[PDB]
Amino acid sequence: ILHYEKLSKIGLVKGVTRKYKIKSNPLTKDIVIKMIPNVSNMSQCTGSVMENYKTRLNGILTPIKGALEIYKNNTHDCVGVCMAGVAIGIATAAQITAGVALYEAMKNADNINKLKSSIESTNEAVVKLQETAEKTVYVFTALQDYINTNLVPTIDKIPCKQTELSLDLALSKYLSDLLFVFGPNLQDPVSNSMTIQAISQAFGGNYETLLRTLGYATEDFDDLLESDSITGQIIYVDLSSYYIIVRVYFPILTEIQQAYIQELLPVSFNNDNSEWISIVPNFILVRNTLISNIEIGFCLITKRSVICNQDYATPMTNNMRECLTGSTEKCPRELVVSSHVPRFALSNGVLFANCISVTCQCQTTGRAISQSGEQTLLMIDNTTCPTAVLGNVIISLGKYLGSVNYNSEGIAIGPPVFTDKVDISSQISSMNQSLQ
Amino acid sequence: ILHYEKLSKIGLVKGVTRKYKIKSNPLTKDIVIKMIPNVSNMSQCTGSVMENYKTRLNGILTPIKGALEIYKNNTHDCVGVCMAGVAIGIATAAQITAGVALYEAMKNADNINKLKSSIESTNEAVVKLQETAEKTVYVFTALQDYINTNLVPTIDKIPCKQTELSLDLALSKYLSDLLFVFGPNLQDPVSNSMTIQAISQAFGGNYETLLRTLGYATEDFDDLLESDSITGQIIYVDLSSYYIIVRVYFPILTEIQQAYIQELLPVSFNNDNSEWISIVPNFILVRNTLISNIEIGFCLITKRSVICNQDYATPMTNNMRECLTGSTEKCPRELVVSSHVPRFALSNGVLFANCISVTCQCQTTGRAISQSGEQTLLMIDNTTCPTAVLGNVIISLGKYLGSVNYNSEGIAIGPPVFTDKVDISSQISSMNQSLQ
Amino acid sequence: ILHYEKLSKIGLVKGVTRKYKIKSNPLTKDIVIKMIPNVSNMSQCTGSVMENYKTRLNGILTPIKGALEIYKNNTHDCVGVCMAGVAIGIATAAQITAGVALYEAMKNADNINKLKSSIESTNEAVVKLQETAEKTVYVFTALQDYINTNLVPTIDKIPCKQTELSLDLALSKYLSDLLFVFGPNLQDPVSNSMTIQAISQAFGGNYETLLRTLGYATEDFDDLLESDSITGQIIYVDLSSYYIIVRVYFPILTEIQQAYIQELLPVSFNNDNSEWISIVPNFILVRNTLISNIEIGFCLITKRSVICNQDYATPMTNNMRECLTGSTEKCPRELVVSSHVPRFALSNGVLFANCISVTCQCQTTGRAISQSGEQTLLMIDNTTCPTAVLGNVIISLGKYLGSVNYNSEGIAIGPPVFTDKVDISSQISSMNQSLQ
Numbered sequence A, B, C: 001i002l003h004y005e006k007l008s009k010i011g012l013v014k015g016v017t018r019k020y021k022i023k024s025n026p027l028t029k030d031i032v033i034k035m036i037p038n039v040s041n042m043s044q045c046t047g048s049v050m051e052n053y054k055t056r057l058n059g060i061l062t063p064i065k066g067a068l069e070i071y072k073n074n075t076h077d078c079v080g081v082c083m084a085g086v087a088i089g090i091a092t093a094a095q096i097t098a099g100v101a102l103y104e105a106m107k108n109a110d111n112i113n114k115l116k117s118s119i120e121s122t123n124e125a126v127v128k129l130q131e132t133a134e135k136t137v138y139v140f141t142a143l144q145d146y147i148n149t150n151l152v153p154t155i156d157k158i159p160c161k162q163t164e165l166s167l168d169l170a171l172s173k174y175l176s177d178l179l180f181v182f183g184p185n186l187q188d189p190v191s192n193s194m195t196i197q198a199i200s201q202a203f204g205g206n207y208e209t210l211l212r213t214l215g216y217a218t219e220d221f222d223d224l225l226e227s228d229s230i231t232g233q234i235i236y237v238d239l240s241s242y243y244i245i246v247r248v249y250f251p252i253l254t255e256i257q258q259a260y261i262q263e264l265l266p267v268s269f270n271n272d273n274s275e276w277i278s279i280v281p282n283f284i285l286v287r288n289t290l291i292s293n294i295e296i297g298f299c300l301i302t303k304r305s306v307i308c309n310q311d312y313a314t315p316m317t318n319n320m321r322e323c324l325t326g327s328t329e330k331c332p333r334e335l336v337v338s339s340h341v342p343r344f345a346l347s348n349g350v351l352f353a354n355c356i357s358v359t360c361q362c363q364t365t366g367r368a369i370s371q372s373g374e375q376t377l378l379m380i381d382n383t384t385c386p387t388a389v390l391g392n393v394i395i396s397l398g399k400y401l402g403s404v405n406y407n408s409e410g411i412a413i414g415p416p417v418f419t420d421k422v423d424i425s426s427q428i429s430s431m432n433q434s435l436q
């Protein structure tokens, strides 16, 4: 376990405790995104912009169909999914799993494609199609709202050459937004790591409409959405009607048993007439009594749980392990030169303040609280005095659950470090000479 | 303090000198952002979209008020702001300061909330309300412009079922834009480090309107705005009318006395029949004769000053200070293999170039400029000849201010390094292996 | 030169082979971007917003003209381009080259400026003007389409105070979008490294319209566009009509002879009853039998080529070069702690899998595939059994081309490493302590 009391003297005050959960057991739903709007009522003087747009869009969608066909031509049934690796050549585990999912989805994709005329005939942003007697499929058109709201009502009040230019500009804007996702960046359409937010770029970035139409099945919807857990996969691309079929995955957030995330608050501390800040990860992941780093940039942090779409646990150095489990001397530290580093923190009702680097007096005492040159931090609870003053904040404090004689006991202190990108090169290069 | 001559002989040509500026003394103004538009004039067939949007927005905003209420409950002027830390539990210095500011703003927030009916009744993008007999408050409604410009005029030209769909799509787009900032990502709404641009996402990202309506208080407006110095804080959330109160901070740019930013220009140089580029920071902070690094990626680099919303000074390795103070050998270098690395530079009118890599000839005599094999760079000035050429550029040069015999004196050059992400891991691994 | 067979035993399975191509031989086109829209037809109720917008835009643009005038006043024909470095002061190689290009473009800029009245009289998003008897120039207005589609048609259906507010909001949104690029961030406007997508932010981000109107005539267009290969440069700023002149560069992709990019697929492998992953870059660049790294994150990855707007070759550690050329023991490895690390891969129809972590039972044999406690990965080809099963995927396999005794030969393995930044700091600091 983590030794919070020893970490506090370093400057690492214990923070909130959060539970760890990852995506599992995804459900599947199929949607059709029509990437070309219907212009039946505006065709009177739509000009020649549509042929150019179709050619440009075919130039984008052709690589997608080409990258799908390699798995399409190698997936079939033999006397489950039964693939042929000779004509596949290069494939990772994720690619092969995505191909299996693609073949599985083809069973419904065939019946979806059976309604090609209905898909093309759609002229609203969201349309319901009776895909079978007991199931339905929704159709999303990229720019149908804009055409039905702005361009169509203004088809005669302005010279419709200007309307042609406006439609061309709208389509060009849509394509420029698309090219970030569906352009040559999408080298691997056979994969399910593409988030619904990115897929909605084919719909103008309005993923909320897609999710609301499909259904808010769970109460953990927002955590799944922000954490990039709701993903989709393209399973069919049509170069005649210019539409794609996307299978959207709706997973459930499953708590990881015997696992939690502990956050450590860094506080500057005094040592040798100078201020220092400890260098340890802000978030530590504990799972089944095993301490390991978690890369938290991709994960989502809430008030009670950490939500990740993938198991983002990363290895932790053994020295870091002993720094977090009591051995303070192995805990690295950095000198502080900036004057905007926190100098006190409150945890469990008791504040850990660097009472020498900031004015520090209590309230009922009406006197100052003195921090000697040997103590890194000062523990202030209501044992010494029940209300403290720090700058312009007057705060009352609760009892401490740790050692009664905390402020009278010191510890060893670790060696200094520097964490700049180029400082790493200098340190490695310099000591290499020392090694020789 | 920086030895520019030796740095140039390394390949680090002295660049522009800029002053250091940080924000301080922030003035405060209060604005109200209503996140639900008024649909009174278009409620004839808006449908059930409004109730669903209200439910979604209530779900979005409930955690915000839940987090604010933790502090709002435990701060009550007692026998200055006087907070109870027992029920706060977990808090940092910045969070406690933000809570103090929140309570201070509550005194005016009470009078602002006294105008709940007026805030609800707003039907314009920007509305002026008399806070007091002398003070006024501006109300910003997110989608009011869109509704009043598009949905109201086109309320009967199109079937209003389509209008309901259009309004639903617009609100969904608004919510998708919001969820980046106001969604579960906003775990800590108490803190006041959220930029005005991010807050404007609740107003469609149009922070320029927010700032212009309040007032361009100073000529340093753009530097403050880009550097993220203009920040806001949510001080009250109402779920009955779905609006928030934001206290916008307008700091002033105060230059730090006896401090400046020095920029070094890297130039590839010849050494041992090959090309190298020195590995040192592009920007160097000198403050009160103390040299320190600066994570300038978060700051703004203008022509005459560096603007930072916080003091971003970070420590610099001692060896690196020795390198910048004259110790040539302690500066690391990287072998260059790219052919698109700069090979000459101009400072104070004197030309530093690597004539081995790029051909140099001098126009006033029409003969080549020769760089010998043991010289890193060639200093070319009008002392040598008034005009030299470099490929297709003909340039005239001033006089050097350093040593007259610059080109005849050599230095000691540093040790090679590699700066790739995996190179660090490989170097550490081998360097451990040698020690064992 | 790369020993794929030995890399497979580590877990680095050979992937796709791509060709390396860079920007070269850029063509030049001239366009005019007018950042103030023509509002002649809305002048009845335009209000006073236009004067304030003009003042804001003048404040935005004055630094740009000030920075251009440094090279404008210091460049003239001398008895090619002939610059004066005395009054330039500070300049890099890129800045000087950009200034030379700026002067070269001034010849056409004068003829463009001769049509100032025509430029300022434009009232459409894209307008064609004849700068000479033979050549023509296009004009792009930032917000003309929005005005002519929304504000003009709605000039009487709603009170024009609302129209004035709407125009002010639109201009403020346009300025908010602009300030990310054309604001104080644009410290060097002379340089030509700014992408066309960024330049289009002055046109609403519709770079597709610019490129389509300019008449592209290449099959490598999408690769050039994604890779940020198409760039522009501002060559003149007018503070009276508020327009800028941009010289757009259209290059050609030239394949680098004797150069290709090799991709390596990481696969978790068993060692000492534990699962590990190798720390080696995903992409390796080979040029004339010289191996080098590449920050391919800046580049674009396609199915058969890597496209970069600059030569992004970076040096590689010598030990690392030995690692990629058969010396297996120098390759670092990291202990897999997550349960979402790939565990099998397919290359050339040959399946590399870690049968310890994932059960393998190939259907043709009808029995499970057993991997011992000495073999890092198990090679499956149709010699041992044609079709293999891994979980839910049934795959048929080709024949190996390397050693037929692959599964019986073992290799040496490397030392463990950790890649976290804090882990790097802990590692570096710790062995300084042991070194002494």
Ligand SMILES: *[C@@H]1O[C@H](CO)[C@@H](O)[C@H](O)[C@H]1NC(C)=O
Pocket: A040, A041, A123, A148, B162
């Ligand atoms: C378009 O034309 C059809 C007739 O084919 C008509 O039913 C419909 O109302 C028109 N408008 C829209 C928005 O579809």
Ligand SMILES: *[C@@H]1O[C@H](CO)[C@@H](O)[C@H](O)[C@H]1NC(C)=O
Pocket: A069, A070, A073
């Ligand atoms: C897949 O098969 C189709 C015909 O069924 C063919 O047109 C296409 O080129 C094939 N794709 C390959 C072999 O990659």
Ligand SMILES: *[C@@H]1O[C@H](CO)[C@@H](O)[C@H](O)[C@H]1NC(C)=O
Pocket: A349, A382, A383, A386, A397, A398, A399, B086
């Ligand atoms: C300190 O505060 C706790 C509540 O947090 C209280 O129970 C205890 O009596 C207090 N001790 C004093 C006032 O001495």
Ligand SMILES: *[C@@H]1O[C@H](CO)[C@@H](O)[C@H](O)[C@H]1NC(C)=O
Pocket: A427, A431, C428, C429, C432, C433, C436
């Ligand atoms: C390495 O150890 C020496 C011991 O004297 C110390 O002075 C130096 O600062 C240390 N450097 C690093 C980068 O750990």
Ligand SMILES: *[C@@H]1O[C@H](CO)[C@@H](O)[C@H](O)[C@H]1NC(C)=O
Pocket: A429, A432, A433, A436, B415, B416, B417, B427
């Ligand atoms: C470390 O020093 C040795 C001997 O001086 C040298 O051979 C080796 O290349 C150095 N390693 C570096 C600088 O990474």
Ligand SMILES: *[C@@H]1O[C@H](CO)[C@@H](O)[C@H](O)[C@H]1NC(C)=O
Pocket: B069, B070, B073
């Ligand atoms: C704050 O106080 C109110 C009213 O007493 C209560 O409803 C709410 O739950 C409290 N919130 C806390 C204690 O976090």
Ligand SMILES: *[C@@H]1O[C@H](CO)[C@@H](O)[C@H](O)[C@H]1NC(C)=O
Pocket: B041, B123, B124, B148
């Ligand atoms: C709604 O209509 C009334 C009718 O007089 C008008 O006064 C009011 O300004 C309208 N509201 C909006 C927001 O347009």
Ligand SMILES: *[C@@H]1O[C@H](CO)[C@@H](O)[C@H](O)[C@H]1NC(C)=O
Pocket: B349, B382, B383, B397, B398, B399, B400, C086
């Ligand atoms: C050389 O350049 C200097 C500027 O540094 C100038 O003052 C001088 O007149 C030039 N010509 C000489 C020194 O002959």
Ligand SMILES: *[C@@H]1O[C@H](CO)[C@@H](O)[C@H](O)[C@H]1NC(C)=O
Pocket: C066, C069, C070, C073
């Ligand atoms: C350049 O010259 C013009 C007059 O020709 C002057 O107005 C401007 O200020 C000069 N700029 C600089 C940087 O000297």
Ligand SMILES: *[C@@H]1O[C@H](CO)[C@@H](O)[C@H](O)[C@H]1NC(C)=O
Pocket: C041, C123, C124, C148
């Ligand atoms: C303004 O109105 C005139 C009236 O004839 C028209 O010719 C011109 O095109 C209009 N300007 C526009 C639409 O930008």
Ligand SMILES: *[C@@H]1O[C@H](CO)[C@@H](O)[C@H](O)[C@H]1NC(C)=O
Pocket: A086, C382, C383, C386, C397, C398, C399
């Ligand atoms: C393995 O597959 C290849 C074609 O990929 C075939 O030529 C060979 O005969 C097969 N070997 C066996 C034993 O079936």
Ligand SMILES: *[C@@H]1O[C@H](CO)[C@@H](O)[C@H](O)[C@H]1NC(C)=O
Pocket: B428, B429, B432, B433, B436, C426, C427, C428, C430, C431
């Ligand atoms: C250094 O090598 C030793 C060899 O026994 C190993 O135990 C230790 O973990 C290594 N540490 C680092 C930071 O590489």
